[PDB]
Design a binder for this molecule. Structure first.
Ligand SMILES: CC(=O)N[C@@H]1[C@@H](O[C@@H]2O[C@@H](C)[C@@H](O)[C@@H](O)[C@@H]2O)[C@H](O[C@@H]2O[C@H](CO)[C@H](O)[C@H](O[C@]3(C(=O)O)C[C@H](O)[C@@H](NC(C)=O)[C@H]([C@H](O)[C@H](O)CO)O3)[C@H]2O)[C@@H](CO)O[C@@H]1O
Length: 192
C-alpha cells in the first residue's frame, strides 16, 4: 500500500498566527506579488494567489490577520508563505461547531467520534481550516500513518460547503479563499 510521508511532514509543520497586523506591498519584482508583514524580528512575505491578486491593490492594508506556514520556494526566501490573509475580528468569537469523524482502517474496521471544534475568527481562510484540522487528525487520529485518503467537509449554515481532499495538499489558490467563520455549522471528516 502507499505511504504518505510528504503529507504528514507538511501538515505537522509549525504554523504562525499574527493578528491586527499592517500589511504592505513593495514594488513588484516578479509576476506574483507579495504582501509583507513585520510582527516581530522577521519580515514575512505572503504570496498573493488566487482571489488575492485582484483583491489587494497598492495598500497598505491595516487590521489584517495572517495564518502562516513557511514553505520551500525557488527564491530560497526564509519567511515565505501562501494565502491565509483575512480581516481581523471586530470582537471576540467563540463559535462551537460539531466535528464528526468516521475512519475506516485497512482491515475495514470503522470508528466514529463526535467532538466540538472552536471557531475563533469572524473571517477565516480555507488555509487555516485545512491546516489545523489535518494537524488535529494526525495528532488525534493517526492520519497519514496507515490511511491517507478521504475528505474534510466544512458545512455552512446557508447550505454551502468547502471540501478538502486528504490524499493531496490543498490547492495553492484555495489557500487565499476566505469564508464567514460565524456561518460554519459543522465539519464532517471521512478517512479511508
Ligand atoms: C487544476 C486545479 O487545481 N483545479 C482546481 C479545481 O480542482 C480540481 O478539480 C476538482 C473537480 C477536483 O477534481 C480536484 O481534485 C482538482 O484539483 C478546483 O475545484 C474544487 O476542488 C475541490 C476539491 O479539491 C472541491 O471539489 C470544489 O468544489 C466545492 C467544494 O466542495 O469545495 C463545491 C462547493 O459547492 C463550493 N462552495 C461554494 C460555497 O461555492 C466550493 C468552493 O467554491 C471552493 O471550495 C472554494 O475553494 O467548491 C471544487 O470546485 C477549483 C476551485 O477551487 O479550482 C481549480 O479549477
Amino acid at each position: 500500500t502507499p505511504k504518505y510521508e510528504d503529507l504528514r511532514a507538511y501538515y505537522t509543520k509549525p504554523s504562525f498566527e499574527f493578528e491586527k497586523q499592517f500589511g504592505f506591498m513593495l514594488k513588484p519584482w516578479t509576476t506574483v506579488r507579495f504582501m509583507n508583514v513585520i510582527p516581530n524580528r522577521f519580515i514575512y512575505k505572503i504570496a498573493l494567489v488566487g482571489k488575492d491578486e485582484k483583491k489587494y491593490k497598492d495598500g497598505p492594508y491595516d487590521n489584517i490577520d495572517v495564518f502562516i506556514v513557511l514553505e520551500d520556494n525557488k527564491y530560497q526566501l526564509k519567511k515565505y508563505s501562501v494565502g491565509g490573509i483575512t480581516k481581523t475580528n471586530s470582537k471576540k468569537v467563540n463559535h462551537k461547531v460539531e466535528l464528526s469523524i468516521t475512519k475506516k482502517d485497512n482491515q475495514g474496521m470503522i470508528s466514529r467520534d463526535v467532538s466540538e471544534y472552536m471557531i475563533t475568527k469572524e473571517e477565516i481562510s480555507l488555509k487555516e481550516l485545512d491546516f489545523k484540522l489535518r494537524k488535529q487528525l494526525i495528532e488525534k487520529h493517526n492520519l497519514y500513518g496507515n490511511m491517507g485518503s478521504g475528505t474534510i467537509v466544512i458545512k455552512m449554515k446557508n447550505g454551502g460547503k468547502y471540501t478538502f481532499e486528504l490524499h493531496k495538499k490543498l490547492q495553492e489558490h484555495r489557500m487565499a479563499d476566505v469564508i464567514d467563520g460565524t456561518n460554519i455549522d459543522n465539519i464532517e471528516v471521512n478517512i479511508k
